[PDB]
Amino acid sequence: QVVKLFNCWSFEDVQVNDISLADYLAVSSTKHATYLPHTAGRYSAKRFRKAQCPLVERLTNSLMMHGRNNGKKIMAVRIVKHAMEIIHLLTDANPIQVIVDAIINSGPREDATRIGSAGAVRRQAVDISPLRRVNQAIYLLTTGARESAFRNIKTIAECLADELINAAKGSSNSYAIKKKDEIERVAKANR
Amino acid sequence: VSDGVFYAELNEMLTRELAEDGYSGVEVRVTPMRTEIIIRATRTQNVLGEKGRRIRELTSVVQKRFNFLENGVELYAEKVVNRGLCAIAQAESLRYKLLGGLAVRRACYGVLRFVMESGAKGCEVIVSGKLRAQRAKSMKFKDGYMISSGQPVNEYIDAAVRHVLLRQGVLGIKVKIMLDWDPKGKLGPTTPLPDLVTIHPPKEENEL
Amino acid sequence: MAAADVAYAPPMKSGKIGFESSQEVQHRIRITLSSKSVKNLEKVCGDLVKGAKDKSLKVKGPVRMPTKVLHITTRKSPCGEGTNTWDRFEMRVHKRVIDLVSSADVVKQITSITIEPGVEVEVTISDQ
Amino acid sequence: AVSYCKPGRGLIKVNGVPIELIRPEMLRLKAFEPILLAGRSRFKDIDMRIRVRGGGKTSQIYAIRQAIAKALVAYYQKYVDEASKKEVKDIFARYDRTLLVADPRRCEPKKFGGRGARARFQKSYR
Amino acid sequence: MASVAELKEKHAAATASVNSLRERLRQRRQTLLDTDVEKYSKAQGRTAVSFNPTDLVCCRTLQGHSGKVYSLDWTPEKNWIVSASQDGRLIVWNALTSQKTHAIKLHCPWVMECAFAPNGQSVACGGLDSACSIFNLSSQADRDGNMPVSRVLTGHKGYASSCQYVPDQETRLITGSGDQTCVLWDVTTGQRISIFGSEFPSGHTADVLSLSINSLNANMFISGSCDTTVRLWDLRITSRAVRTYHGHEGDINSVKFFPDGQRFGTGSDDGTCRLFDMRTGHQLQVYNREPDRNDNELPIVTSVAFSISGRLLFAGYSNGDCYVWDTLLAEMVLNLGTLQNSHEGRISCLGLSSDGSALCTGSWDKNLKIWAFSGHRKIV
RNA sequence: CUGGUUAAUUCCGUUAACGAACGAGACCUCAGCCUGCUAACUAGCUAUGCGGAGCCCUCCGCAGCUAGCUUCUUAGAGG
């Protein structure tokens, strides 16, 4: 067997509980998954399931960027990798499973676009088509970790682990869950 | 770079001497120590004059100017191979009416109206405003085909320019022409090149 | 056993003088011909002809090898002024083609020079 | 004897493989693989096919890649070993095929057109 | 030799001269070759002793060429079949199991020309690229096909369209090529020993898409091309391209000799396949599907091959079937039909084994089948 | 005008029109233009040596246009 993925963690044991979200969360690729970094142009066809994924690719990838300045994906891959081992040592559970718990908790069911029509501006609440859920969620988890790292003596690999474990536990301490249920609260109300 | 310099320095010198000049266009190839300078011209006569002093004094200058090596030179006469594709005379002849005038409009059509008659397939003549010494109004008229730009790089367009110092006022210009190409046959116009065949019944016929 | 210092001596032939004879054994040989034009289409055709000539002469020299590229690309917003976009790359190659013979006879030099096909091709007989 | 070289290419930098089959040691610039690319995840991209296959001792790969950064080096290195095997064995055609092969990519840096502050993000004004 | 239909006369003096010369030479030749034709094979064949059961079926199904399988030729040992495909790949297969021994990534697309050497050593193919590259076969485990002293033997102006070995290695090439010319070559050196160049009818002026080597001494060879002629060229002597038939309306996109050597089957792209008798020098037989109802997607087309006995012609067409014919009788023995259950595709090549036991068909659908007959009579 | 399509009076299908130019595309350009090769070697690989190194087994260096071919380099063709 000899599982790879940084050479320490499996990924075909990782369960996605939300059936709708699961069918867009690729933990398996054409031969099986891996995480080793690249890119691969498949564009953006619509209606249907429409792309292949990796969460782990999105998450490091949110980190290099958000936030902010200066860093690189080699640094970002390193921080995800450090955050994943910090997560495993504080949960004793596969950190790929813990990011899936964080993404499902941090991925709002409904969202709230701002439309001007007639003489005024309404927001009537909208869909959030599941790649957008996955993302809002990752981003908020990353922006939280970034924000926590800016203003605390806590490595961000730790801060990412800290935000990710709080989100993957429903804890309103997390920026990502707190913004998720803020968004669902406005989207549910503005009808 | 230094091999480059010589092409550029030489090219201007051959252009300036070969300016107004009532003759017709002027290649130069400069082989080790010698200049061919090929003039395509009727009034080959004034430049040569045989033996004398004439032929050498103009040359000699170029050498002492910027170039090269303890010798003499050579000079050859030519004709010209249906004039369009390059000259001076073509340019000057329209200036040689744009001296004294003549209906300005007539020259435009007229210089174009010739050349087409010798084939040309398009020709575009173009003249600077300040006709009647009023405000500018540049003129066109172009007949037939003709392109410098869009079609392929190898349409083989003669295009030039010239200038006209009238008394009162400049009358620019830029004549263009696209005809057959440098005398030996080697037509290739405007991509695609079509051709099929007619028929085919067959028993003898084809390549195509 | 051991003790190796390696030279060439097949005999004969090496790149520094490609030995041939006679004329008191020819001790001349190293010529380099570097032929530099604007346009390729013309060059190639001249270049091939040199290769052929060597082949005829007695002892066969190698064909054209055409090496590395010289660009000056200068882009000016030509002017207005003000002109500061939709500016310009007119970009200029000049190309260098270096053709040897294995043996540089008296006879080679003289045939090659007399009838020399350069129109725009600038070709320098060279030189120790 | 044994030495089969099929030369891939995909990004700048050139990998010549002459492979004589034995124990699974890996060289680059004729120097040991993990240690030359010490501290890298992209280094283990290469390592992927000299484990996973169920062949370990069947490839001693001797690799030289010359000229460009740390990152580039892996993607090429890999391709070659697969392609060579496919020619001999038609049953390990499903070795080449299912484990990913073949991208030039062709998206290595792009033209710089004028006005661009980088090349393509035209000025903040004008 | 082929009667021409009444055509409306023109009243020009100059042409009559044209008719004069042309008709004077062709009728004078027509009265000698024609006389030898005692009967036609079909007429004579009526009161024949019968054929045995035909029982070919696909015994095994093979796969591995990347693109469309263009061409095949079987090896003399009865065990290898090669084959070349548009991707540039050349595969040598042993057919029964179907194991792949060798593969070389050869070069061009349009590499529709793989042949087996009489020795068994080598293959040639080539196509777009303008060369034929040779390759020895070895037992070596490593199998880099590409280096083992290959060689670009040939240079043509245009695209190699056909190649074939004679009965020997020493004359490894007899070619007719897109460059138009046809050429005989000496192998090691690669020099063109001689060139044969002739005409529009007659020689071939246009591209040779096939030629086939005559079976005997192999004194002559017949070629086929677009100029709509089947032209045998006298290789052995002065090389006046010797004897010609131009029966066809359309390309004779193919040409294959009988094992007897007596006939060749002209498979052409024009909506018939025809058989031409080289010895008598007249059209012996016509293979055509005369009723308006009996039409397929395309009428019959590109390629032909013979049984060892010569009784059967198995043929590939663009329409995707094979109609099997009794050559002598003129009957169709049978229809063979293969693969899809809707939508067409070319069957471009079909080639007999050396022992004659079986045939391999390659198709654009990207599959191969080998059909075989075992036993004298029906199985079991 | 229309009907459709497309970056594109782009092409098609209609039409009181039938053409026709000029832009666009095509074209020369560069990105991967590669690829098996034809071409030569800068150079690469590879061979053979030899100065040594670990303890010709393994490894570095350079040696001779010395041997050949090649991803590099390079021009072409095709593709």
Half-sphere exposure of residue A108: CA atoms within 13 angstroms, side-chain side:
24
Assess whether the previous peptide bond of A67 is cis (omega < 30° from 0): yes
Q: Does C87 touch chain D (CB under 8 A)?
A: yes
Extract long-range pairs of E166-171: CB within 8 Å, 24+ residues apart. Answer: E166/E118, E166/E213, E166/E218, E166/E221, E167/E118, E167/E213, E167/E218, E168/E118, E169/E117, E169/E118, E169/E119, E169/E121
Rounded to 10 deg, the angle between the A55-65 and A131-150 helix axes is 40
What is the b/e burial string over A128-155, where b = at least 16 CB atoms within 10 angstroms of the residue's CB?
bebbebbbbbbbbbbbbbbbbbeeeeee
Q: Which residues pair with E312 in a beta bridge?
A: E326
Task: Give CA angle at A177 (A171, A179), nearest 5°.
Answer: 135
Neighbours of D101 (CB within 10 A): 16
Tell me how far apart the alpha carbons of residues E198 and E92 are, in angstroms, rounded to a whole number.
37
Give the C:D interface size as CB pairs under 8 Å.
13
Neighbours of E143 (CB within 10 A): 20
CA distance A2 to chain D (A): 8
Tell me how far apart the alpha carbons of residues E39 and E368 are, in angstroms, rounded to a whole number.
40
> What experiment produced this structure?
cryo-EM
Sheet (strand E303-306) strand order: E303-306, E312-316, E322-326, E332-336
* Sequence-ordered list of residues with C-beta below 8 angstroms from that of E92, at least 6 positions apart, any chain: E75, E80, E81, E82, E83, E100, E101, E102, E103, E123, E137
Cβ(E191)–Cβ(E172) below 8 Å: no
Tell me how far apart the alpha carbons of residues E273 and E232 are, in angstroms, rounded to a whole number.
18
Torsion, Cα E215 E221 E222 E225, to 10 degrees, reads: 140
| Interface touch E142/D5, C-beta < 8 Å | no
Q: Does D contact C via 3+ CB–CB distances below 8 Å?
A: yes
Q: Which of C87, C83, C94 is nearest to C40 (CA)?
A: C94
DSSP string, E68-131: -EEEEEE-TTSS-EEEEETTSEEEEEETTTTEEEEEEE---TT----EE-TTSSEEE---SSS-
3-state class of A185 per DSSP?
A: helix
Question: Which region holds residue B50: left if phi is over 0, alpha if psi is between -120 and 50, else beta?
Answer: left
| Interface touch A77/D41, C-beta < 8 Å | yes
Distances (CA, A) of D122 to B128, C84, D117: 37, 11, 6
Distances (CA, A) of E316 to D109, E337, E352: 50, 11, 12
Q: Does A81 touch chain D (CB under 8 A)?
A: yes
How many Å from the N-terminal Cα to the C-terminal Cα in chain B? 47
The spacing between the Cα labelled CA in E299 and the C1' in F14, in angstroms, equals 36
A residues 149..168 contacting D (CB < 8 A): none
Tell me how far apart the alpha carbons of residues E175 and E159 are, in angstroms, rounded to a whole number.
12
Q: Which of A166, A160, A191, A161 is nearest to A179 (CA)?
A: A166
A15 φ/ψ angles, rounded to the nearest 5 degrees: -95, 135
3-state class of E243 per DSSP?
A: strand
Please report residues of D whose CB lies closer than 8 A to that of C83.
none
Q: Does B192 touch chain C (CB under 8 A)?
A: no
CA distance C85 to chain D (A): 6
Strands, E assignment, chain C: 33-37, 65-73, 91-99, 122-124
Tell me how far apart the alpha carbons of residues A29 and C55 are, in angstroms, rounded to a whole number.
61
Question: Which region holds residue D4: left if phi is over 0, alpha if psi is between -120 and 50, else beta?
Answer: beta
Tell me how far apart the alpha carbons of residues D3 and E142 are, in angstroms, rounded to a whole number.
7
Out of D44, D52, D99, the one facing A36 most closely (by C-beta) is D44
Q: Is E237 exposed, middle or buried (0-12, 13-18, 19+ CB in 10 A)?
A: exposed
B121 φ/ψ angles, rounded to the nearest 5 degrees: 85, -35
Q: Does A76 touch chain D (CB under 8 A)?
A: no
Tell me how far apart the alpha carbons of residues C119 and C39 are, in angstroms, rounded to a whole number.
10
CA distance D118 to chain E (A): 41
Tell me how far apart the alpha carbons of residues B205 and B183 are, in angstroms, rounded to a whole number.
30
Instruction: Report which residue type is found at B27.
Output: E
Cβ(E66)–Cβ(E103) below 8 Å: no
Q: What share of chain C is helix, strand, coil (3-state, %, to 5)?
A: 20, 20, 55
What is the H or E stretch that residue E313 is in? strand E312-316
Q: What is the DSSP letter of C60?
A: P
Residue C102: both structure tokens together: 């294995």
Residue whose pair of structure tokens reads 């059961």 in the numeric block: E53
What is the b/e burial string over E273-291, where b = at least 16 CB atoms within 10 angstroms of the residue's CB?
bbbbbbebbbbbbebeeee
Instruction: Report which residue type is found at A111.
Output: D
Residue whose pair of structure tokens reads 């032909």 in the numeric block: E304
* Sequence-ordered list of residues with C-beta below 8 angstroms from that of B141, at least 6 positions apart, any chain: B108, B109, B112, B124, B125
Half-sphere exposure of residue B137: CA atoms within 13 angstroms, side-chain side:
7
Cβ(A53)–Cβ(A23) below 8 Å: no
Please report residues of E whose CB lies closer than 8 A to that of B201.
none
Cα B1 to chain center, whole Å? Answer: 28
Q: What is the DSSP letter of A6?
A: H
Cβ(E327)–Cβ(E41) below 8 Å: yes
Q: Which of A91, A99, A163, A173 is nearest to A134 (CA)?
A: A99
What is the b/e burial string over E173-199, where b = at least 16 CB atoms within 10 angstroms of the residue's CB?
bbbbbbbbbbbbbeeeeeeeeeebebe
Residue A94: both structure tokens together: 């596969």
Q: Which residues pair with C41 in a beta bridge?
A: none
3-state class of E25 per DSSP?
A: helix
DSSP string, E181-239: -EEEE-TTT--EEEEE---SSSS--S-EEEEEE-SSS--EEEEEETTS-EEEEETTTT-
Residue A87: both structure tokens together: 């997560």
DSSP string, A80-113: HHHHHHHHHHHHSS-HHHHHHHHHHHHS-S-B--
- Dihedral of alpha carbons E109, E113, E114, E118, sign: negative
What is the b/e burial string over A100-114, where b = at least 16 CB atoms within 10 angstroms of the residue's CB?
bbbbbbbbbeebbee
Tell me how far apart the alpha carbons of residues E234 and E221 are, in angstroms, rounded to a whole number.
7
- Bases of chain F below 7 A from a protein C-beta are 21-42, 44-46, 49-51, 59-61, 63-67, 69-79
What are the residues of chain B with a beta carbon less than 8 Å away from any beta carbon of chain E?
202-207
Q: Annotate chain B with three-state secondary structure.
A: CHHHHHHHHHHHHHHHHCCCCCCCCEECCEECCEECCEECCCCHHHHHCCCCCHHHHHHHHHHHHHCCCCCCCCCECCCCCCCCCCCCHHHHHHHCCCCCCCCHHHHHHHHHHCCCCCCCCEEECCECCCHHHCCCCCECCEEECCCCCCCCHHHCEEECCCCCEECCEECCCCCEEECCCCCCCCCCCCCCCCCCCCCCCCCCCCCC
Rounded to 10 deg, the angle between the A156-167 and A131-150 helix axes is 130
A6 φ/ψ angles, rounded to the nearest 5 degrees: 75, 0
Q: Which chains touch E (3 or more CB pairs under 8 A)?
A: B, D
Half-sphere exposure of residue E268: CA atoms within 13 angstroms, side-chain side:
27
Q: Which of E367, E371, E283 is nearest to E335 (CA)?
A: E371
Please report residues of D whose CB lies closer than 8 A to that of A77.
41
Half-sphere exposure of residue D19: CA atoms within 13 angstroms, side-chain side:
31
What is the b/e burial string over E55-90, where b = at least 16 CB atoms within 10 angstroms of the residue's CB?
ebebeeebebbeebbbbbbbbeeebbbbbbbbbbbb
Tell me how far apart the alpha carbons of residues D51 and D58 are, in angstroms, rounded to a whole number.
11
Neighbours of E132 (CB within 10 A): 25
Sheet (strand E358-362) strand order: E57-62, E368-372, E358-362, E349-352
Q: Which residues pair with E275 in a beta bridge?
A: E265, E285
Q: Which residues pair with B91 in a beta bridge?
A: none
Distances (CA, A) of B206 to B138, B202, E23: 52, 9, 22
Tell me how far apart the alpha carbons of residues A170 and E274 are, in angstroms, rounded to a whole number.
83
The spacing between the Cα labelled CA in C90 and the C1' in F28, in angstroms, equals 12
Q: Which residues pair with E286 in a beta bridge?
A: E274
Tally DSSP H helices, then E strands, for chain C. Answer: 2, 4
* Sequence-ordered list of residues with C-beta below 8 angstroms from that of A90, at least 6 positions apart, any chain: A161, A165
Taking C1' of F50 and every protein CA, the nearest residue is: C4
Task: Give CA angle at B57 (B51, B59), nearest 5°.
Answer: 105
Residue whose pair of structure tokens reads 């266009």 in the numeric block: B25
The breaks in chain C (C to N more than 2.5 Å) occur after none
What is the H or E stretch that residue A164 is in? helix A156-167
Cβ(E123)–Cβ(E133) below 8 Å: no
* Sequence-ordered list of residues with C-beta below 8 angstroms from that of E110, at least 6 positions apart, any chain: E70, E86, E127, E128, E159
Neighbours of E329 (CB within 10 A): 18
Residue E147: nearest nucleotide (C-alpha to C1'): F69
* Sequence-ordered list of residues with C-beta below 8 angstroms from that of E350, at least 6 positions apart, any chain: E72, E303, E304, E305, E314, E315, E316, E322, E359, E360, E361
Sheet (strand B122-124) strand order: B142-144, B122-124, B176-178, B157-159
Tell me how far apart the alpha carbons of residues B194 and C52 are, in angstroms, rounded to a whole number.
37
Give the A:D interface size as CB pairs under 8 Å.
24
Resolution of this model in Å is 34.0
D62 φ/ψ angles, rounded to the nearest 5 degrees: -115, 120
Please report residues of D whose CB lies closer than 8 A to that of A30.
98, 100
Neighbours of C109 (CB within 10 A): 14
Residue whose pair of structure tokens reads 């393509």 in the numeric block: D120
Tell me how far apart the alpha carbons of residues C95 and C67 are, in angstroms, rounded to a whole number.
8
